[PDB]
Amino acid sequence: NFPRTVMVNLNIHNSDYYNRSTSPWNLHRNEDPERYPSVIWEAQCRHLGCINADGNVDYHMNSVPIQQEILVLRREPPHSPNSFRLEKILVSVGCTCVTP
Amino acid sequence: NFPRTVMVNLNIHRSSDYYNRSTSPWNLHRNEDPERYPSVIWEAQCRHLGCINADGNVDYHMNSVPIQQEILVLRREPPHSPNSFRLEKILVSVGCTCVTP
Numbered sequence A: 001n002f003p004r005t006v007m008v009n010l011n012i013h014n015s016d017y018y019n020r021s022t023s024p025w026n027l028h029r030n031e032d033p034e035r036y037p038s039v040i041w042e043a044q045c046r047h048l049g050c051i052n053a054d055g056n057v058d059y060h061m062n063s064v065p066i067q068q069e070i071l072v073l074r075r076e077p078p079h080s081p082n083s084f085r086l087e088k089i090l091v092s093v094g095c096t097c098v099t100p
Numbered sequence B: 001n002f003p004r005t006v007m008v009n010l011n012i013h014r015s016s017d018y019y020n021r022s023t024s025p026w027n028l029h030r031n032e033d034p035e036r037y038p039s040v041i042w043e044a045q046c047r048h049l050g051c052i053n054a055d056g057n058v059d060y061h062m063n064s065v066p067i068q069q070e071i072l073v074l075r076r077e078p079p080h081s082p083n084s085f086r087l088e089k090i091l092v093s094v095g096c097t098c099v100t101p
């Protein structure tokens, strides 16, 4: 497992819209100073069931979050403002309605 | 503005088949790009225009839309460089949800 060190220039140079969803969700920020990005919003489902056409909640269905695996930069060594090792974390990118 | 170069150790220590019971199911599509890390990117593609109800049929009174999110990749700068990158912001479909038109 030889380390593949790489230079990266951090200078980039380039849920409320899905509120009509049957399985709506909110955004919860995740702060971690020893990580890039430091702030990660995570999708928290608003209901246990799914909202039907009428408007009320149907609990025969389940509003589950969509958990995906992405990469984040972990400070190696700790508290290093210029040295990172990328790590594989699990986050919720949204919600979807599923059947039992 | 002023460039912000940092050191990144690239040595680390079916996502659509999981949510097949979704009312707004989707598949994964390959997006290949040599000058980008990671190279392969799987984007979610909704399998139906409408959503699936309790009867298993497709209700077109509802719409299954792709959940688009802004993520980061690593663009090669200079081009074809195997050790130097500048991260860019790209837009991908991380899944599908069922909405009401």
Ligand SMILES: CC1(C)SCCN[C@H]1C(=O)NCc1cccc(C(=O)N[C@H](C(=O)Nc2ccccc2)C2CCCCC2)c1
Pocket: A036, A037, A039, A040, A041, A068, A069, A070, A071, A072, A073, A086, B015, B028, B037, B038, B040, B041, B042, B043, B044, B070, B071, B072, B073, B074, B092, B093, B094, B095
């Ligand atoms: C795209 C999907 C997950 S969607 C579901 C189906 N296909 C997946 C897929 O194909 N994954 C592979 C892939 C493709 C492209 C990029 C990433 C990636 O891990 N980008 C990182 C990132 O941006 N993380 C982040 C942290 C907190 C807030 C927002 C974003 C950055 C990487 C470079 C260093 C810095 C971090 C991964």
